[model samples]
Target chain A: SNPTVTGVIPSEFISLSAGVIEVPPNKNITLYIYGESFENVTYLAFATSRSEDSFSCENHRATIAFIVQKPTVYSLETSVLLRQLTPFESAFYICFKLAHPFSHNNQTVSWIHATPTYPAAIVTLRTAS
Target chain B: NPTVTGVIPSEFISLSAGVIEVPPNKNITLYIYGESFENVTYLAFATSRSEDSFSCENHRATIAFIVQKPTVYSLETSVLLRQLTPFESAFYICFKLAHPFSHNNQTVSWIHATPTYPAAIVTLRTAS
Candidate 1:
């Protein structure tokens, strides 16, 4: 059937354990994505806004893309490894995407819908002691 | 030393020329084929299904299929392009987000379509 796709998911369907988190350089933190369909989830995006790009290299995508903790079909907990944060960059946006397997004849179709911008968190950088 | 295998592609999506074109005012099935979907869960649209961008069209059905041995996953969607004119056409896209768990970063597989359009002198189209 013509795929009936959701352009956006409710913010409540997915989120982080907290509204915002604080992390220090080289430190690590445990965050969780509260949602379903983690089958292909392997990364969490940290930026300033859903559509806005991350500001500094610390907020750069390449760094955050690899910090996703191992996600299982059911596991929601994510392990994030912190990097050096620029003084100009204090907060970050956390976004997620699930390529929901949809029904077609008898199989499935896959694609990135709108890359919904609603981020899961606004992680702040903490000054190391 | 470096090793590579066709059994699995480096990118999340791949097919010999994934783009397809159909005859005007004809019923057809569009397919996004790949090697395997064992790890797939859901499919999301970049701009949502068919912005109804085409002049005349109807959503028929889409099917997800697979074939074994070498194993191929077909992301299929059925549609009736009810074009009022022979040259009427639109573009459709199917995208897959590929985020590697053990890599440097993530990338997207862009699947694009054009209902009725010919290549301009500067424009060139081919299947990859």
Candidate 2:
């Protein structure tokens, strides 16, 4: 007899909560991770600073934690909470982890920010207000 | 012969995905050139018949990204299929480029097929 295990395929794609995320230095921001998978997800998703690092089941300096909300085998939503957008948190990529039939697989998403056109005016405004 | 080279290997004509979902923006790139195309004069995206096209020449939204080569010229372009009804499922992504002094315009194209309702119905649930 053959047995079947549900929800076990590679991730299809990923999208970000904010395409260009910018926040104050000491403010909390939550990033939403959205993607699709066709397999039972053991480890739903995590954020990473290094594009090549795998999201171990544990969290570290480069790894940001997230909670998975699996609706079906077709889609999944995960979210991560960060205390502040310090210089250290400025750059990072979100990696969606999928539980493959034999091993683990992952996908990445990117973001960008708009630079102020007037450097001195922006600096003055930040300091004044 | 007013030579303007405009042929890509048949084996090289392809898309990133043969199939995709709605709101599809397929990225199609090609390495195109003419032997005498030392300087690229123009590049645009158009229909196969060379009518009703989008100007990627200094256009803000859909400018063709052209890269100059010592011996040849090339550009990358794409097509977006949005709200595509079944009645209008067939179309072509074609390119037209040229050199300052060429008799024939260089043209290349790919066929795109869109089917209605390409997404699967997935129930919305969450496991916290």
Candidate 3:
């Protein structure tokens, strides 16, 4: 049988609501995010210093790429040199929204289509107004 | 019939072409640029030490706001505390695109839809 799932979440989940950015500590921040993914596969990025605690960044990638199936709306820029400036006291979150939407066994692989995935947006690094 | 057009582009004139970034200075440099603009407007941001050189920041606010109408592609962030560390010889460019799309008799605007402007992408700094 072989029923295996990696990280599932798809019933209609694709939202980017530009709502989280404060960046200001040692100051070297550039986190740009745009979105669009409905088909193809392979998207993984996880990091969380304390956004409810779950992504510890052992090795997912500071940056990775592979998108080409086409719906168009993707722009991601990252230049984080926080070096733990911790002015806002450490609070980070980055989950490219494809925990595991493509685990096969019988029927379960449609977290918006997939294709070198990318569907998560959250950037915060406060201490400057 | 003063069809004297200085810069009149319609069918919603708002297009973008990107690729330019250089930064390093007093280490407080943040400049973000994206697009989208349409009706009821007032969006002005210019700085060109050399994109033809004509904007010198005599002061119109390196950052300011006035919204009763503004739309979409807006992800602008500016934090240039560089004071001048100088290394690449300086050739900066920051323009959210809208200098005279409408003025001096006004009536010539449609940045995609309404109250919008953003482009001429360039980011540079040092002093890390």
Ranking by lDDT: 1, 3, 2
Tens-digit per-residue lDDT, A1-129, candidate 2: 111111111112222122223223223332222222324444333232433333332342344445556543323434444343345544443333344432234433121111211121110000001
Q: Model 1: residues >4 Å from true position, as ranges? A: A1-18, A48-64, A67-74, A96-129, B1-128
i-RMS, every candidate? 14.5, 19.7, 16.0
Give the per-residue lDDT digits (tens) of candidate 1, residues B32-92: 3332344432232222234333211122122221222212333333433332223322223
Tens digit per residue, CA lDDT, model 2, B25-126 = 434333332233333433332222223333322222223444434233222222332333343322222323353222236332211111112232210111
lDDT of each: 0.31, 0.28, 0.29
Model 2 residue runs over 4 Å out of place are A1-38, A42-45, A51-64, A95-129, B1-78, B81-128
The candidates score, on chain A by TM-score, as follows 0.42, 0.37, 0.22
lDDT tens string, model 3, B1-128?
01000110101111123222223222221212234323223332233244333332331223432222211422323243333323333323323334435443544321221111233233332232
The full ranking of all candidates by DockQ, starting with the best, is: 3, 2, 1
Instruction: Give the backbone clash total of model 3.
Output: 26
Q: Give the lowest summed-lDDT range of ten residues in model 2 chain A.
A: A120-129
Over A41-112, each residue of candidate 1 has an lDDT whose tens digit, in order, gives: 534545432334322222234344534443333224556665555666554444443335454445553322
Each model's DockQ?
0.01, 0.02, 0.03
> Which candidate tops DockQ?
3
- Let me know the TM-score candidate 2 reaches against the reference structure: 0.27
Q: Write the per-residue lDDT of candidate 3 for residues A1-129, one digit (tens) a residue.
A: 111111121111112123233344445444433333322223433232433332223332332332322222233433444334334444334434343544445655422211211122223222332
